[PDB]
Design a protein around this ligand. Sequence first.
Ligand SMILES: O=C(O)c1ccccc1-c1c2ccc(=O)cc-2oc2cc(O)ccc12
Ligand SMILES: O=C(O)c1ccccc1-c1c2ccc(=O)cc-2oc2cc(O)ccc12
Length: 133
Amino acid sequence: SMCDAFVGTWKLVSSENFDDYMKEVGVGFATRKVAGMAKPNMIISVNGDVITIKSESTFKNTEISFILGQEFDEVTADDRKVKSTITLDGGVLVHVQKWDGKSTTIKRKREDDKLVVECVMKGVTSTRVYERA
Ligand SMILES: O=C(O)c1ccccc1-c1c2ccc(=O)cc-2oc2cc(O)ccc12
Ligand SMILES: O=C(O)c1ccccc1-c1c2ccc(=O)cc-2oc2cc(O)ccc12
């Protein structure tokens, strides 16, 4: 399917304005500095209708499994317990995280041989680029 373009192993190669985006999300100082340093590997896989996104770094190891359009519980190292929904909108994986009446969007798009990640929170944008690993 269309998810196959996202499937594979990805390595973080560039990050821009991630600290200012995490500040705007409400991420604490210690967690921002820890997350800001990490150069994660990201494994995106598909099994039936279930999408798995595994991240691996010196900071942590995370795993989320989900069905497109089906809301799920996601864990974060901040004062936020989030309800997330991931949908596929015209080739773009749109990840909406909602907590305490607020929301942030993480968009992933395929550009050349890269996975371009756009994170938006109340006008503050961070761009992160991954390459195939
Ligand atoms: O994938 C990202 O780069 C990302 C962008 C905005 C907010 C969080 C992340 C992020 C993750 C988002 C979803 C997920 O399933 C796993 C993530 O893992 C990350 C690991 C990091 O070191 C650092 C960042 C992440
Ligand atoms: O919140 C975390 O556990 C975390 C810790 C280290 C590196 C990245 C994250 C991180 C996420 C990790 C996994 C995940 O599924 C979602 C994450 O979302 C984040 C969002 C932030 O604003 C800021 C950070 C994250």
